[PDB]
Symmetry: D2
Subunit: 178 residues, 4 copies
C-alpha cells in the first residue's frame, strides 16, 4: 500500500486481533446484568473506528455503538463538539473506546464531559497507551498495548488522514512528516 | 448467545459476509488502480455501515481514506448532523452503504455529494433489497441481493440493538411490534 | 394585525420591552466596565431578537456567540466557535421556566473555565424559584401562562411579534 | 463612544438603516401577500438584520438559522436547518454580498430541497457582486468596495454590536 513510508512494524495484525480477543473477554466478564440495558461503547471519530468495530465483536455481551465528533479550538484539552451523542447516556453503562492515549488531554476532556451526563458507570478502553499517558488523572481500566513514544500509523491511526486503513501498526518514516 | 429468542434465522453467515467483502475489495481495488496522486475516499453515513466500511477498507488493496457523515430525518429529505471533515472536490469518492431499500437516502446522498464536484462518484452497498434493484442511482458494487426481510446484524439495527452481530439475521416480528 | 384572533391579551408591549432592555444594557454596561470584550452567549432561537437588541443597548463592547441544542439534558447541535477560557461571559436567555436548560448551559460553560459567568433572561416564570442557578439580570417576572412573541414561539410561529402576549386557547 | 478612534467615518447611520429596513419589509410584505414566509440566515453577520427585518415585514415570518465554516466556493455545514423547507416560500437573508460565492453555495443548497419559491434579500451589496450570477430580489444599499464594520459586520469578531455601519481606520489592521 505505502512503499517507503513505513519504517518498521510495531504491532502485527495478528498481535492486534489477539489482544482485542482478550480485551473482549475481560470486558465481557466485568460487565456480565441487573440493568437490562446493553453496554454502551462510545467512540470519538475517527481513529478508534477500526478498533471499536473489532472490539465490539470480541465482547461476548450485547453492545451498542455511539459516536462523537470533535475538533480542537487550539491547545483536559479544550475541545469543540462537532457531533454530539445520538442518545442520552443517563443511567447507562458506558465504555469509552480510544485508539491511543498520549498527553491524556482528549480523554480528560471526554471523561468530564460524559461524567456530567450522569451515566451509571464510566470506564475507559484504549488500544494504545504512550509513556506520557501512564500515570494520568483519568483511570483506564483496559489497555491493549503499552507502546513507546514513537509516531505510529495504521489500524485507524493517521498522518494527514492517510495510513488509517493498514491492518497493522507501524512506525512512520520521519521523511513523511518532516 | 448474544440475543437468544430474538433472531428467527440466519440470512448470511459471517464467513459468507467476509468472503464477499474480499471479492468486493479486489474488484474495487482493480477499478481504482486505473495518476492523480490522491487516495480513494470512502464515505460512510453513520452508523450502520461502520462495521462494513472498516472491513471493506482493509480488503481494498489500494490506499483508502475515511470520511463520515451523520444525518437525520426531518424525494429523500435529509438533515445533516455532521458534514464531511474535508472538501471532496476533485477527489475519487466511493459511497459505502450498509443497505439500500427504498433508495431514498442514497438519492439524497448522491446528489448532495455530486454538487461538491468530485472527480468521480461510485456507490458500494453490502445489502440491496428488491425495491432498490431498479433505483435511479447506479450502484457499481453490490455485496448481496437479499429479500425484503427486516434484517439485523453487522451494523444493521433495530432500536440501536444487534449492530454488533458478526452475521446478518432475520429478526423475530415479536421484537419490533 | 399579523395573527388575528390568536393573541388573547398583550403582556408586554414593544415600548415596555425596549425600555427595559435599555435599562438592562445600562446596568450591565456599568457592571462590566473593566482587555477582551464582553461575550454574550445565546441559545437559538428564542433569545435571538432579545440578544440583538440587548447587545446594542450595552455601552461596552460586546461579542456574539450562538449555541444550538436539542432535547434527547440536551444534545449539542452547534457548539461555540471559540475557546471561552479566560473570557467574561454573559448567558442571554429568553425565558427561564423550569430552569433546567439554564442549569445544563451553566454547567457546560463553567467547565470551559471562563473568568466570569453571569445570566440574563428577558422573562422569568414562577417555576424558576425552584431552580438553583443565580440570575444577575431579569427583564420581567411573569405568571405561568404560555406566552408568545419577541422570539418566543408556539410551533415556530409568533417569534416575529414585536410584543409579547398570551396565546388564545383556540390555537392549541 | 463604543470603540473610540477605531471608526474613521460613518457610512450608514442607525436611523438610515432602520428606515431602509422599514421600506424593505413593506416591499417584501406586499410581494408575499397558507404557510408562513421563511427567513433563512447564515450565522452570524446577518442576525441583527434578520431580527429587525422580520419585525418590519407586515406578514407572518419564521426564522431558520444555518451555521457553516470554510473547508480549510463550497462550505461545511455545522448547523443545518431545523425543518424541511419543502414547498415553503423562502427568503435568504444576507448581510453583504461581495464576491457572491457564499450566496452562490447557499442558493444551490436550498434549491435542492425544493422550496415553493426562493428569493434573496441582502442589506448590503458591493461592486464585485456584478459577476456573481445569482439574482437578488431585495437590496438595502449598494456600497463601495471599502471594508466596513458594524450592524453584524465584524473585523475579527469585533464591532458587530454597532448600531450603524462604519469604516475602520487602517490603524486597526
Ligand atoms: O502515534 C501517534 N499517531 C497518530 N496520532 C497520535 C499519535 N500519538 C498521539 N496522537 C494523536 C492523538 N491525540 C489527538 C487526537 N485527535 C486530535 C487532533 P487535533 O484536533 O487536530 O489536535 C485526532 C482525531 P483522529 O482520530 O480523526 O485523527 C489524542 C491523544 P491525547 O494527546 O489527547 O492523549
Ligand atoms: O432490514 C433492515 N434492517 C435495518 N434497517 C433497515 C432495513 N431495511 C431498511 N432499513 C433502514 C435503512 N435506512 C437507512 C437510514 N436509517 C438510519 C441509519 P442507521 O444509523 O445506520 O440505523 C434511517 C433514517 P431515519 O430512521 O431517521 O428515517 C434507509 C435505507 P433507504 O430505504 O433510504 O434505501
Ligand atoms: O410561555 C412560554 N412561551 C414559549 N416557550 C415557553 C414558555 N414557557 C416555557 N417555555 C419553554 C422554554 N424552554 C426553552 C427550551 N427549548 C426547548 C424546547 P423543546 O425541544 O420542545 O423541549 C426551546 C427552543 P427555542 O428557543 O427554539 O423555542 C425551556 C426553558 P426552561 O423550562 O428550561 O427554563
Ligand atoms: O465590508 C465588509 N465587512 C465585513 N465583511 C466583509 C466585508 N466585505 C466582505 N466581507 C466578507 C463577507 N463574507 C461572508 C462570509 N463569511 C466569511 C468567512 P472568512 O473566510 O473566515 O472570513 C462570514 C461569516 P460571519 O457572518 O459569521 O462573519 C463573504 C461574502 P461573499 O464574498 O461570499 O459575497
Ligand atoms: Mg482518539
Ligand atoms: Mg490524527
Ligand atoms: Mg445506511
Ligand atoms: Mg436504523
Ligand atoms: Mg431559551
Ligand atoms: Mg419553543
Ligand atoms: Mg453573510
Ligand atoms: Mg468576518
Amino acid at each position: 500500500l505505502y512503499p517507503g513510508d513505513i519504517k518498521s512494524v510495531l504491532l502485527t495484525a495478528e498481535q492486534i486481533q489477539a489482544r482485542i480477543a482478550e480485551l473482549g473477554e475481560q470486558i465481557g466478564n466485568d460487565y456480565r446484568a441487573t440493568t437490562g440495558q446493553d453496554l454502551l461503547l462510545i467512540t470519538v471519530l475517527k481513529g478508534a473506528v477500526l478498533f471499536v468495530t473489532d472490539l465490539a465483536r470480541a465482547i461476548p455481551v450485547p453492545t451498542q455503538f455511539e459516536f462523537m465528533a470533535v475538533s480542537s479550538y487550539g491547545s483536559s484539552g479544550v475541545v469543540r463538539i462537532l457531533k454530539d451523542l445520538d442518545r442520552d447516556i443517563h443511567g447507562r453503562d458506558v465504555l469509552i473506546v480510544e485508539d491511543v492515549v498520549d498527553s491524556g488531554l482528549t480523554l480528560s476532556w471526554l471523561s468530564r464531559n460524559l461524567t456530567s451526563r450522569n451515566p451509571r458507570s464510566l470506564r475507559v478502553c484504549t488500544l494504545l497507551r504512550k509513556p506520557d499517558a501512564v500515570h494520568a488523572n483519568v483511570e483506564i481500566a483496559y489497555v491493549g498495548f503499552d507502546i513507546p513514544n514513537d509516531f505510529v500509523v495504521g489500524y485507524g491511526l493517521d498522518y494527514d488522514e492517510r495510513y488509517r486503513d493498514l491492518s497493522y501498526i507501524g512506525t512512520l518514516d520521519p521523511r513523511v512528516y518532516q
